[PDB]
Every structure is written in C-alpha cells, then in structure tokens.
Nucleic acid binder design. Sequence first.
DNA 1: ACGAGTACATA
DNA 2: TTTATGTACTCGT
Lengths: 340, 319, 326, 338, 330
Amino acid sequence: MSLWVDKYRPKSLNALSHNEELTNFLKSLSDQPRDLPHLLLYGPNGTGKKTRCMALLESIFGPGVYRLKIDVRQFVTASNRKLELNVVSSPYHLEITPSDMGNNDRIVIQELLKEVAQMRYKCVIINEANSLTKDAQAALRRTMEKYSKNIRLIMVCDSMSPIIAPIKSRCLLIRCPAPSDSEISTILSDVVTNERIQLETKDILKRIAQASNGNLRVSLLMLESMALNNELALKSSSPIIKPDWIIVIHKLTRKIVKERSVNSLIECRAVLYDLLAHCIPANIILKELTFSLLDVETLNTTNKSSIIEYSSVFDERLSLGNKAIFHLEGFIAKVMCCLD
Amino acid sequence: LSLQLPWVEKYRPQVLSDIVGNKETIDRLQQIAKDGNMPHMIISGMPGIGKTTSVHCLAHELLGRSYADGVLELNASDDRGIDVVRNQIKHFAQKKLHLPPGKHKIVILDEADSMTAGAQQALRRTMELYSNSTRFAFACNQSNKIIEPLQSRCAILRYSKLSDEDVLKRLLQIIKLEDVKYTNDGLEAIIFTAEGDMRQAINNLQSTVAGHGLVNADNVFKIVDSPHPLIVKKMLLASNLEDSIQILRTDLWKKGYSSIDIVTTSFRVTKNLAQVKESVRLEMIKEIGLTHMRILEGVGTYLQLASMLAKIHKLNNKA
Amino acid sequence: RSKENLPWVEKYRPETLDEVYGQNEVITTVRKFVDEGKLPHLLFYGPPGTGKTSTIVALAREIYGKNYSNMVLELNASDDRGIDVVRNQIKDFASTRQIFSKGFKLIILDEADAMTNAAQNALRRVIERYTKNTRFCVLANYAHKLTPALLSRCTRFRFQPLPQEAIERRIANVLVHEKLKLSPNAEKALIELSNGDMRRVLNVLQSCKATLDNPDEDEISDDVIYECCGAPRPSDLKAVLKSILEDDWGTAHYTLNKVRSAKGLALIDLIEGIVKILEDYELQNEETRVHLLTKLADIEYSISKGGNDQIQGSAVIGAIKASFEN
Amino acid sequence: REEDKLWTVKYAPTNLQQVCGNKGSVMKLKNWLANWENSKDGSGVFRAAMLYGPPGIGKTTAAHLVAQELGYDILEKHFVIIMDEVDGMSGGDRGGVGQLAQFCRKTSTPLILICNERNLPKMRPFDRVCLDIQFRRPDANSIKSRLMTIAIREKFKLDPNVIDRLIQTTRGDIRQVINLLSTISTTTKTINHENINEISKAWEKNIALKPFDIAHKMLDGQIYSDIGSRNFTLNDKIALYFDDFDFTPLMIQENYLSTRPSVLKPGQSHLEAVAEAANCISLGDIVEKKIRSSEQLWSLLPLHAVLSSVYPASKVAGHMAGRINFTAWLGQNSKSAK
Amino acid sequence: QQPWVEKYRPKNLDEVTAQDHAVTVLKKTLKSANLPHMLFYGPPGTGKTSTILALTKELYGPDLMKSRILELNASDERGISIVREKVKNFARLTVSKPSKHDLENYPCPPYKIIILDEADSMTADAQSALRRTMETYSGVTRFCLICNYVTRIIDPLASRCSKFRFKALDASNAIDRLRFISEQENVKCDDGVLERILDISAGDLRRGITLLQSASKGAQYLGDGKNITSTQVEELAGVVPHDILIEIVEKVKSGDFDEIKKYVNTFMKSGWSAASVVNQLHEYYITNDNFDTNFKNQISWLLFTTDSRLNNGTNEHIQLLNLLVKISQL
DNA sequence: ACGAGTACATA
DNA sequence: TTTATGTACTCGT
Ligand SMILES: Nc1ncnc2c1ncn2[C@@H]1O[C@H](COP(=O)(O)OP(=O)(O)OP(O)(O)=S)[C@@H](O)[C@H]1O
Ligand SMILES: Nc1ncnc2c1ncn2[C@@H]1O[C@H](COP(=O)(O)OP(=O)(O)OP(O)(O)=S)[C@@H](O)[C@H]1O
Ligand SMILES: Nc1ncnc2c1ncn2[C@@H]1O[C@H](COP(=O)(O)OP(=O)(O)OP(O)(O)=S)[C@@H](O)[C@H]1O
Ligand SMILES: Nc1ncnc2c1ncn2[C@@H]1O[C@H](COP(=O)(O)OP(=O)(O)OP(O)(O)=S)[C@@H](O)[C@H]1O
Ligand SMILES: Nc1ncnc2c1ncn2[C@@H]1O[C@H](COP(=O)(O)OP(=O)(O)O)[C@@H](O)[C@H]1O
Ligand SMILES: [Mg+2]
Ligand SMILES: [Mg+2]
Ligand SMILES: [Mg+2]
Ligand SMILES: [Mg+2]
C-alpha cells in the first residue's frame, strides 16, 4: 500500500542486509528442511522477527507464501459467550495471532490445532507469544510434543520471562539482535535513494536513526512523516517530531518533578485514564515512564535507586494483575513520595 | 441391625417447656399458641438453637388435632422452585377445611433462606392474599440473604447463641433420662466442645456414653478435641515465636488438620480479633491472605505457616 | 486373578475392622456403636489416606449381610452430589423402607467437601427428616469447605495421623505375606518419609521389592529406600548444612554441586530437609528465625514457579549465610 | 372472625385522612386522580404515576383509599387496578418491561404502581414517561398519634418519647412497627424506656446501601478511630463490603485520596499516607485476579475487602471535600470498547 | 529423516539410561502384574513421557495398547463434567479380550493403563473425581499422573500414586547418552564440548539435543570439516562472551549511574536474554574469591530477587538495570 | 421428560 | 467487562 513499511520489506534472504550471522543461520536451517525443529525468535521490537520467519518460510516452502488471504472463524467458550478472532489463510502455511482476549485464548488455539492437524509439515507462527496467560503455552507444550511430524511450531515473542520453562525447553533459541546506528543509517539512506529526498547533511540521518533506539518500524514511520511534512526535503534544520505518547509522558514527568501535591496526582491519574483509553499495554508505559524519570539531571543516585526499585516492584505487581490503573497509581505515589 | 432411635429424636421436644434457650421468645410462642392468632414470623440464627423444633412444637400446640392436613410441612429436602412451591402453597390455601375459630393453619418452610428472588415475590403475594385463612412460618439459617420486605411483612424473632445454663440443664435432663454417671469436669468439657451448639453437645454426650460411659474430659477430647477458633486464638496471640511454632505444630500439624483449614481459621480469627490494634489487624489479615494465596496456588507446606507466624511476630515486635 | 494382580494400596484393603491400626480410639468407639446398637450420623475427619473409607466399608460389612452391594448406595464426587440428583435419588432411597427384616439404612458420603452450599442445605434436611431408619456417614478432608450445620448434625470423628506403630505393623504384615526382609535403617527411613500416609509407605515398599533383581533371600537397606523414593540422605543433608555454615562460598558451592550431581538430588527436597533440621539446633537470637522462615518460603515459592536450579541453590546458600551472620 | 385478623389488617386506615406521613404525596395523588378526567402542574396528563419508597408504609393502602373515596373499582363507572410489587419482576419479563411501559403510556384507567426502594437497573422503560411520586421515611407525629390510638384500643401503654427510637430502629416501617408492637404486647403489654435497648438490638432492620452510599460510610474518619472501632467493628466492615462487592473496590479507589486524612500518624503526610495505601490496592489486584481465574478460588472473597476497600480507606480517612466520586475505570472501558 | 527431538525417542526401557531407579521397577514389573499407580514428577525433559510411552509399548504390544490405553492431556478438556462422562465410562467397562498373538510375544497384564499428562494445570474438581476414580475400579484399570510440578498435585493424589522422582540430568549423569548420540550421528567434537553443553542446559537433555542438532546443521552447512569448539556452542546457546561480562562488571564497580544506564540500554539492544545474564553473573561472582562474604550473600539475594521477579512476566531491561544499579551501590 | 438459551450468585 | 461450575428458570418440541 501507500505505507512505507510494506514496500521496503525484504522479498527473500538475498535482501536480508541486517545480520550476516543470522542470515547464515537461516540458510543452515534451510539446508535440511526435514530436520527443522521448533523455532523461537527473540529480540527487541522492530528487529524484524516476523520478517525473518517469513523469509524462512520462503526458504523452506518456496512459492505461494506471499499470497495469503484472511478468514474469520467463530469460537465457543464457557457459558454462552461467543468470541471472534481473525486468522490469515494461505494454501500451504497457517498462522494465528493471540490478539484476542488472553483468558480463553487457549481453547481457540486448541481447536485450530486439532482442526488443521487431522492429517510436508505445516508450519504455524504465533507472533507476540508473550501475551499467553500460561494456558495456551500449557496446550502447546503437549500439542507440539505429540505432533512433531505434521505441524512445526514457530514462536515469535520477546522477553521470554513470562513464557514458561518447558516451552523454551522444546524450542530453539535464535537471536534477532537490534542493529547498530550504522546499519539503520544505511537502510535509511537506501530508502531515501529509492525515493527522491533532498538530503542536505548526513547528520540528520544519524539523528533520525538514533531517535528510534534500535527500532526499525518507528524509524521508518517517522522518516515517512518527515518526508510528508518537510516536502521530501531532509534539511539539516528539520524539526524532529515524536509520537504524542512520549510527549505526554514527558509532560507528566515534568509535572511530577516540578511539584509534589494532590492536584498533580489527580491530573496524572486523569492522564493515566486517557492513556489506558488510548488502547495501549501498560508495561511499555511503565518502562518508558521510568526512562523519562531517569533522564532528569536533578535526580540523585539514592533517589534514582529508590525509583528503579519501586519500578521493579510495581512491574511484578502489574504482571501479577489485570487492573493496570492500581499499579501505575501506586508507582506514581511512590515516586512522588521519594521526590518529596 | 436393630438400632435404637438416635438421641436427637429421643430428645426432640413436643412441648414449649422442654425447649431451652431464651425465655422471652419461648414464652411469646406459648402465649401465642394459647391465643391462637399466631402472626407470620421469620426465624434465623446459627444452627442448632431451636429454629425448627420450636416451630414444630408451636404448630403442635396450635393444631394437634389436624396435624396431618392442616400443617403443610414444606421441607428443603423436597423440590423447591418459583412455581412448584407456589402451586403447593395455593393448593394448601384454597382448601376450605373448617378450622376452629381460634385456630389457623401453619405453613412451614424449613431452611427457606436459599430460595430465589421470584419465589419470595410470589410468596409475599400469596401471604398477603391468604393471611386470614393460613399463616406462614420460617426457620431459615441467616436472615441477611432474605429480602427486607418479607421481613417487614412478618414478625422478626431472632434467637441468640445458647448459654451454658440452658445447655447444662438439658444435658442433666438427658443424664437423668438415661441414668448415666457423669462428672462436672466432663460436663464442662462437653459444654466447651459444644461451641454453643447444643446438638453437637448431645452428639458428644452420646459418643462419650457409648465409648466409655463415664463423662471425662480426656475421652471427650479423644473423640471431639478442642475447637479450632480458640486454639488459633492462642497461637496468634503468643508473644514468643518458637513457642508459637511448637504450639501450632503440636495442636494442628500433628493432629491431622489441613493447612488451608488452618489458614482460613487464622483469617477468621484475625477478622474477629479485638485485643490488638485495627491497623495491625489489617496487616495481619493481608499477610494471612498472602499465605492463603500461596497455599491455594498449590504450595501446601508447614513452612508457609512458619513464615506466616514469622511475619506475625515481625509485626508484633514492630520489625 | 484377584490377589497378586493389584497395587499394595488396594491389594491389602482392610475388609474387616480388625485390620485397621493406629485408630484404636475410634475403632473401639465404632465397635461399641455396632455392639450396643446406637449408631448416629457419622462424620470422619483426618489426613488423606488415613483409613476413612476402608473403616466405613468394614463397618458396613460387619453390620449388614451379603446384600450390602445392591442395597447400600454410596455417592462420591465422581458420582456427583448435585442438589437435583440428591433430591431425586437420596430422598427417594431414604423414604422407601423395606417392610420386613430391617433395622436401619446406611448412606455414606465420601469427599463431601466438594459440593455446593445449596447441596449441603439439601443434605442436612434429608439427614434430619429420615433419620428414624437411615443413617448418614460423611467423609471429608477440609472442614472449612462444608456448612457448619452439616458438621453439627453429624458426629465429628477426627483420625489422628498414623504413628510409627501402625506403619511398622503394616510393614511386618506385608513382609510376612509377600516373603520380604527389611533392615532397621530402611524402616527408620520409611518412618521418616511416611508423612502419616499408609499409601505412600506401601508404594515405596513395592518400589523397593521391584528394585531388587531377586526379591527372595534379599534385604532392603536405607540406601535402597533413598534411591527409590528420590529422597536425600541425612548424611548428605548434614554435610551440606556444615559446608554452608562453615566453609566459604566457593568450596560450599562446589560441595553442594557435587552432592546434587552424585545421585541426582533435588534442590527442593534438600530445602525441606534442611529446614526441618534447622529447628533441631537452638538459635540465640529471634529475628534470624523470621529471616530464615520468610527466605525459605520465598525460595520454595520460586522453585514452585521454576527457574534455573543453580540460581535458587545459590539463593539457599545466601539465605543460610546471611541468616546466621549476626 | 373475632381475634383472627392481624393487627395490620384490623387497624388498616379505613379513611384516606387516617393515613400517617407523606401528606404532600397524598395531596399530589388526590390531585392526580382528580385531574385525570380533565385531560396546571402538568401531572394531569403526565399520568401513570407510581408510589415508590420505603416498604410497608401504606403506598398500596393510600392508593386503595384514594381509589375508594373517588368511587373507583378496587382491583389488584370508574375502575382502577392497584398493581403492587413492580420489582416483583426481579430483572425478569425479558422485554416485558417495555410492555408495561406501553401499558403505562396507553390505558383507559389510572394505573397505579407500587414498589419498594428501587435498586433494579430496569429504570429505562419508566425513566421519564411516568410521574415519580416519591415516598420517603415518614415523620413521628401522625404515626405517633396512630400508635397512641392503637394502644388505647388494645389496652396497653407506651412512652411517647421512645416511639422515636422504635421508628428509627425500623427506619420508618409502619407495618413493621405494628407487628413489633403486637409481638411485644402478646407478652409485655407495657412499653417503657428500660427495654428499648434490647427491643432495638433484637429488631434491627439491616438494609443494603446503593454503591454510592457505602463509599460515604466507608470513607469516614470516625469509624477508624478508637471511639468508632467498637461502634463499627471489623466484622461489620467486611460484611458491609459484601453488600455491593461487585462495585465496592472500584468506588473506594476513586475517592480515598480525595479526602483529608483525619487519622494521620504524627510524622505522616498526605502524600506518604496515600502512597502507603495506593500500593495496597495492587495487593488486592493480585487477589481479585486469583479469585476469579480458572482456579475459581471464591473462598478468598473476604480477604479482598481488606486489601482493596478497608486498608486503603483506613490509612487515609476523614470528611470528604466534595460529593462521592463515582468510579472512572468503568467509564474508561466504554471509551475503549468503541 | 526426522528431527532428533523425536526421532531418537527411547523406544525401550533399557534405552533410557537415566533415572534407573524408576526404570528397574518397571523392568521387574513387566514379569509380574502388581504395578501400582505411579506419579512421574521432576524437571522437564527428563523423559517421563518417553518412559511411559516405552512402558506402554512394551506392556501391551502394538495393538492392545491401542485397544486399552486412554490418554488425556491439557489439549483436551479436563473439567469435572468431562472426567465424569469419560473416565468413569472407560473405567467401568471391562478390559478387551487379548488376541492370540499377544499371549506369546508380550507379557500383557489383564488390566489397562490410563495416563493423565500435564495434571499440574488442572482443577481441584477433577482431583475430587480422581481420588475415588482411582480407588473404585483399581482392579480393572491403572492411572498415571505426569506433571513437572508435583506441588500442584495435592497430598491425596500424590499419596495415592507412587512418587517416582526423576533425577535431574546433571553434567555427570547424561554424558553417555549424548555422547552415544554424537557418534551415532557422526559429528566431530572436542574433549570439553559435551561437558559444556550439559552445564549450559539446566537438566534438559532435549535442549542439549536441540543445541547438538543446530551445531551439526551449522557444521554441515559450512562444510569446512572442523570440530565443534566451545565458542561455537556458547554462541548457539546465547551465552554472553566473557569480555563483555568483564567490561560490564568493571563498569558496575565504577559507579557512573548514567554510564551504567546507557550501557545497559546498549546491552539489551544487543538482544541477549536476561536469564543467561543472571546465570553468567552468578557463575562469575560466586567462583571469584575477591569479594568478601557479605557482598557474596547480598549479590546472591539480588540475583534471586531478579530471577524470581523475571519468571513472573515483567520486563527484562528494568529488572537487569535495577539489579546492576543495586549491586553497584553495595 | 429433556435439550438449549438465558441471567444470576460465588459469605 | 471479569469466569468455570452449579443452580434455577421457562418456554418449546
Ligand atoms: N432450644 C432447643 N431446646 C431443645 N432441644 C433443642 C433445641 N434446639 C435444638 N434442639 C435439639 O436439636 C435437634 C433438632 O435441632 P434443630 O431444631 O434442627 O436445630 P435448629 O436450631 O432448628 O437449626 P436448624 O434450622 O435445624 S439448621 C433435636 O434433637 C432437638 O431436641
Ligand atoms: N489404620 C490403618 N491400618 C492399615 N492400613 C491402613 C490404615 N489406614 C489406611 N490404611 C491403608 O490405606 C489404604 C488406602 O486408604 P483408604 O482407606 O482407601 O482411603 P482413606 O484412608 O479413607 O483416605 P482417602 O479418603 O481415600 S484420601 C488402604 O488400602 C489401607 O491399606
Ligand atoms: N399510615 C399508616 N397508618 C397505619 N397503618 C398503616 C399505615 N401505612 C401502612 N399501614 C399498615 O401497614 C400495611 C402495609 O400495607 P401496604 O400498603 O400493602 O404496604 P406497602 O407500603 O404497599 O409496602 P409493600 O408493597 O407491602 S412491601 C397496611 O395494610 C396497614 O395495615
Ligand atoms: N533418560 C533419557 N535418555 C535418553 N533420552 C532422553 C532421556 N530423557 C529425555 N530424553 C530425550 O528427551 C526428549 C523428550 O523427552 P520427554 O519424554 O518429552 O521429556 P519430558 O519429561 O516429557 O519433558 P516434558 O514433557 O516437558 S515434562 C527426547 O528426545 C528423548 O530422547
Ligand atoms: N534485512 C532487512 N532489510 C530490509 N528491511 C528490513 C530488514 N529487516 C527488517 N526490515 C524492515 O522491518 C520491517 C518489518 O519489521 P517487523 O517484522 O514488523 O519487526 P517486528 O517483527 O520486530 O515487529 C519491514 O518493513 C522491513 O522493511
Ligand atoms: Mg432446622
Ligand atoms: Mg477415601
Ligand atoms: Mg404492594
Ligand atoms: Mg512430555
């Protein structure tokens, strides 16, 4: 489409100018397709783990992988609740996303597995697999073990810590490291040479590369934003722009550091309500909020240590819970107590 | 084989005089049986205090002449529903049996606290329609779940926990009826193991009589030991940590009690505790609940109880 | 087939009331119950695998004749205890009485602490309605999962956990029946790891009998018990405790790794062993006990979650060292 | 039928002027019946008014009396249907509420509805189409005079001043007052101030609190003080939670930090007191997820009261600076659902 | 041509050269028929499923196990109603008549075995069903409970079955099996490669099988004909190199909170799992004798807090940053 | 009588 | 909104 994220996606392993070691690893695993075990790709977001999986299916299956359709199936759960989740369909492979609700997500995966496992192997890809609430993983650790000839499981996730030990035990650990500033600068240069961008100085490319912090999708989206706003002219004085989420987190951090009162608590609670209404997971909000708090030069080592300790405590508290408001409110109260 | 009747029915009262407990309620029941214009009542309380036997005795004193057809004994054991109950009530109310002018029919709904809402909504309509012809009665467990307008339309008669005197005199009546040797120490052991309930006291008495015949504290504790709330009370208020650990082990861990039962009892005791501060009580409750979570997840271990009382003593000595 | 084709737990089920040992206080009470003809509603309580259902089956066989199979109805959790099922089965069974040659009827409720509160409200009224010729026996392991009225109406019976006397009597009986020989250290270890359950003892002794290449003319010692049950040796526990308490970090870590790798020892079992041998040693101060208890609870919680074993092993080492650093 | 009818039946108000309390409501009902056939204040045409309020106060009795004085045919040339217990549906009729709404809209007779205090969420069919004649807790003058008349006719005496205590104990339930007087007079005809305490402690009429009302009671600095500890024990606080346990933990979190901490420890500040209570809600977050997970551990429900409703409201408590704050987490899901 | 995770599955009881305490009992009960209910618990990858599959294959041959063995796992429904409607029906019916060919080639017991794999993630109502399901019809069927966490199973069900613990596959117990697999697959290796592979895996022979398969695939793809080196298996396992660990340690020892923060950001952008980092930090600090005892204890507790917080979800970056900051302030 | 859609309670 | 098991209901075939 018109989005820049689909036009520059690699078409085969020849276009994987990201990591020579990872490309050689994929070629080695594609050398013997029959002996391919279950695979687990891990790395920071934007590294292209989905791209590596898709290219691996290209190397294994061959043609017909890029041509796929979308299907919708009905599911039944406890009581009379009915849930709908979209699955993409291809003639050879299949993959299903856990984007549905995380409680009854196990039974949908089970019924898909025993519906497509009635009878060379059919690879299945589970992106963002860390969202499984220890039940879908408990189903997979048996489904892939008992069926190790008809369907091969491909695990796509990051931060394996919520993932249980047996799932990682019956999976292959393959790295997808984030590239340095050089590789992302070169890929941005390739993009702007593919287009017609009036780049004045190469320093702005380095700055827009460093703004992503090891994340290709946000870098490419913000490059498209710069091209649209500045009329395809990447001048040295190009105004840097950031998504409004980081802007409002910076504003909330400034509000906390400038004053420690109760009205500020009400305002930041309202901001938290708005952010959770913006349909965003709370773990990344806590992570980037703690990043913003630690960026202030006024903070001292004892206050920063207390901040990170409370951040870790409320991180495990949020992980062992569902009401994201309580943990964020408690962490903000703790950091305001520490600052005051 | 040839079993004699249990002591429960061997001592089930037939007159209001034999019923033990509070005096005001029983004299009110006797006077309203003498008058005959018995109003609608709701009876609730802890089990084994005379909630349905008093109702049965009152029904006897009211109509002992037409018991088989003028008192509909609607039991909780029988089928219960919004419609199957009201159909039977209507069939029992539409009949034109010529009752005495000073006597009214009694409808008994034993343990009716667990009915649905619509059953109560139909019951209030039937009750207000046929109040002059028939009268209702209830012997429910807890009146909190009973909806308020039914309580308003009826006369609320709530009993209390039986004291030592009435249970003691009932036990002496049982002893003189059975001619069984007894001891005052055995009597006090029985009434302490009765936890207020007198039916449990009768059960322990018959067990003691059958097993040994002599009422002594040792055998009574051998069948029915000390109640868990008070032993957990002593375990939770002990100042010394290792003394508390030894007490809990000897009293609940070597006695076969399940660990989760111990945690639930500790939570209930801390809920009902009044000898310490309220905030300390809340902190004790929350740490006991953390231990409860750690056991309900699957980790049922004596070490969980040990850590629970370690945190208890950490709160006690202000860390 | 019958015998010699059953697990030792079920092969040696007590058919009569004389085969139950360790519960003599309740055994004589129920024997006087059946002899004197005064049997109220029962309520048996105790640890798992502590002779409840075997005792009630033996009592039913002693009381009734050969017709106990087709006349006595026993409902379990697998047989369901729904309120509708109870109302249309148990009430009908208790209401119907055979005209001749009957004293009473017996209904046994096993694992009754698994049904809803409305079910218990139904069962209590079935108990108090047809008790003239029907008795109810209730088996449960959690008294807090049942309504207080059900506990009050039935006669509470608590089974004290089986001591070493009953366990050693059962061991002697099974070795006499199966022609087996045992060593004093083996039976001492069996007492130590019995945990008050006869089923585990029978399973472990069966594993020991199957362990020997030639069961006849062979003796089972403590090492066989430890290797079959997967339990750590007390000498190993003492050595690990001494190494952690006295030796420095590197030597203690190496010794603990060697101890675990010698026979594939488990970290968790070593944890319960060390924590049950701490209290045998007198401690001077008091907050060290609190630290020990909370830290052992935390490491057991982590093990129940999982993780890499060496991390929690070093955690146990640090827990002990920091607790005894005072 | 000598000595057969109940006291609430033999002493029912024969005339409409014999009723006690809600005199303005009685006047409004009389005006609505009078202005029915003429279709000022707009209530004449905005018909199908109900009589809602405390149970057992004479709403059905008042409707019957105003119907019989106007010549309407009593049913439960002018005819009326006095249909009682609107809440008898109990969330039922599965759309029959709409049928009742259209029946209220179009009927040839003055349909009078009687219901108790309204907690059901089925207010939508009757939100703004019917006149809301509100009945409240009655006074203690006309009811007092009726009690004197009943006691005089029944040959027993009672102290005029304790009638306030009897009315407050039952919370304005005239029928319950009559029943209680009959019950006590069956044994103790004389009523004095010595037995008022035991009568009240035996005849307390506990009732639930709309999720907004429980927050005000929970967020009070008196109950957590030394004096209020005995008045409102720890058992009562958890028992209060179970009345609206679905909405109690959400209501406490939205307003616990919006009130001044009247129970501050010396050396404790406002921000630190909230922080010591803000984290405790996250401890109750673990319990709420674990209670209603696939394990279904419902035996842990009383614990969730302390961790999410009591302790957050115990560290900070006092007179709230404004009205009760409704929970906003429910509102945020509506925005996220779109 | 099949993956080594299941192609080399143990098809015989003697093929399982580990946990011989739980193997000799089965071997001796092949001849007899007094097989009690067993509970297979332990670390994952120890071969409990393989052991029970070998026992099932050896007991009932190739057909009586199809006709007798019933399997239920977490993939299928395991509610109380499902248990009542399925396991009760299976246990109530008598065993099938064995074929004439199975009375001479297989010593098949006249009962059946029902396995319950992954019983840890299963409710207590099914537990209430099975406590009497395994006692009412113990004479006609046998029951198996297999779970890596015996703690989830309550005391009753654990006591009813035989607690056959599975020994952890340490570095001194599983060398022979992996070595024999290595010469069976004809892969070159050094003297210490096998010990390093067994040390990296936390008692997971299946994980070691996967690493060996990956190393063999890489060696056959490159085709240079070189033996597998230690650095190769460190790179396959995701183990951080020692120089990066040393520079991380010296940066931590120097304070510099901002420097620690930016280097930790770079280290997590390198894409290395935090569990491996915790393991490497532990094995570096504990073996080193430079630090005094109190520092050793407190850093061990900080590593324990780090991983016992990690395994409950959370973010690896925050946990590792907090760990490094807090050990930098000791 | 039994199967399916329905809402409510779980101290 | 929550989450399986149980209970209850009632209209329909
Ligand atoms: N107040 C009492 N006086 C005499 N016997 C009593 C009394 N309360 C209970 N009993 C005896 O207890 C047995 C029956 O008790 P119930 O009346 O069923 O107990 P309850 O107090 O009514 O509580 P419920 O409604 O049954 S749970 C009979 O043996 C009675 O003799
Ligand atoms: N006192 C005892 N003496 C001898 N064997 C006993 C004794 N108590 C229990 N057992 C043994 O325990 C085995 C299994 O116990 P059961 O009686 O079937 O179950 P239980 O003890 O009632 O506990 P539950 O309810 O099944 S958890 C029996 O086969 C007996 O061999
Ligand atoms: N003001 C009053 N003075 C004297 N008696 C009264 C008064 N109000 C009510 N009563 C009595 O209390 C009874 C209550 O009857 P209803 O009017 O049906 O009660 P209600 O207010 O409609 O509440 P419900 O519908 O019964 S829950 C009347 O029948 C009278 O006997
Ligand atoms: N003792 C052993 N000897 C040889 N191979 C083994 C042994 N234990 C495990 N394996 C290998 O481990 C792989 C899988 O074994 P499994 O039986 O699935 O282990 P597991 O105990 O079932 O792990 P789970 O299911 O996650 S608890 C196979 O390739 C087996 O060959
Ligand atoms: N080797 C590569 N060469 C060119 N583009 C790449 C490469 N790797 C990743 N990309 C870019 O990454 C984008 C897809 O990233 P994605 O797979 O969504 O990351 P993640 O899986 O972490 O979400 C594509 O638009 C593609 O242009
Ligand atoms: Mg009763
Ligand atoms: Mg049993
Ligand atoms: Mg009415
Ligand atoms: Mg397996």
